[PDB]
Amino acid sequence: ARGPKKHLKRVAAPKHWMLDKLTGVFAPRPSTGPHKLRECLPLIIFLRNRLKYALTGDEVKKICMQRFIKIDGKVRTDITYPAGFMDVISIDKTGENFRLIYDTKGRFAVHRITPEEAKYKLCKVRKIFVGTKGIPHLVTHDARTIRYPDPLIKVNDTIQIDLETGKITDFIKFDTGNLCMVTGGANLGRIGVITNRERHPGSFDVVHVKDANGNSFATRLSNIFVIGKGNKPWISLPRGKGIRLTIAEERDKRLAAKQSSG
Template sequence: MARGPKKHLKRVAAPKHWMLDKLTGVFAPRPSTGPHKLRECLPLIIFLRNRLKYALTGDEVKKICMQRFIKIDGKVRTDITYPAGFMDVISIEKTGEHFRLIYDVKGRFTVHRITAEEAKYKLCKVRKIFVGTKGIPHLVTHDARTIRYPDPLIKTNDTVQIDLETGKITEFIKFDTGNVCMVTGGANLGRVGVIINRRDILALSMWFTSRIPLATPLLPGCPTSLWSARVTSRGSPCPVERVSASPLQRRETRDWQPSRAAA
């Protein structure tokens, strides 16, 4: 009979987007409990050892973290298996580098370098809004932040810009038609497109789904659930152009045929 939480993770059972080879070992680092789920995060040890190549072994990663060199969202993290997730800001003060975890077009976390000014904020999706004790309104984001007294205009599924130093909301973007969003789950993970409509359907316990076109203008829209769509900007075509210029999008555009699209 099992007692307590699971503490191990087999390497073959690890998320595919971690890109771990099967023959290096039997086990993979199991993420600690935190703001992101196991299948939606990237442990700090994999980011430092496998992505940045700043360490060769897990022991070296631990020595780096215990010297308090690594910050996530402005806070020092010494846990080598801390789960970093979408839009998290990872800072290394000793080298002066800042990174933001975002998805590439293949649905994998990519090493995206940002400036010191960009590292001062992050975008969070609003998961829930409720009224707590004594009638105080609360807002819960996708990274488990709870903010009191939010703007009354902010609704569920909107995106808020949070100042990492103060933890307060500085700006928000509505989940409206015409805004640019990124898909963070499902078969279209990593896609960036413009919201063209919102269609409500009844499917088990999921009531809403949003239809989002692909970044390539020649391709038809790809549907995704409301839970997986996260608004990133107000109708700016810049993110779409950046993604459509990738080799994957160019290959899809080259293989596109009008007869198939019409069918």
């Protein structure tokens, strides 16, 4: 091509968007934003395929224009804004608040949350550096940057961030035995506790995580995102508690649920 691509074929869209094959040929093609387009939800699908508030593309256009959708404390009129991970989607006219967190199967799930638990947000620091005049800066997993952070925050930690101010309310240190969530790959969406961090100079680090049920899994350091102090998560975990279950036990879970409801 001769320049930037501004289309996304329906087949080429990310799987976790959970789009079908017959409605059309194209996909939302999310605009540039704080999160990469492979791990973001455009607002169009969130208000059409998640909550079914809108039926078509122009219907979700009208709702965004009327300015009730408020992501991360700011009203966003973009139909294809990249929501991302653990971003607070607050719709004040309906009084519901959503924290965007992967489900057990590595897919973003509708997580209704309380209004006072929407006033803060967790964030993963990615790069730490000092700017001109010796001012230390800090960039998070979002494209959000802050100045003057607490000198104890290092890379790949978690910072307790409150909305409408942008300051650091608190922070979570990256250490052994801390609850985390996997944010990419096969183990995406699995809640567990750090057990071991093996390191490889010149390459990606590998960490070992054990969940509540005792299942042990590994992943890259770039897919780690600590959301708890030791054992206690700092956010309301979604249904399923971020626990991975094999093909054997969701089947009997349906049969038990069906039998009870039958």
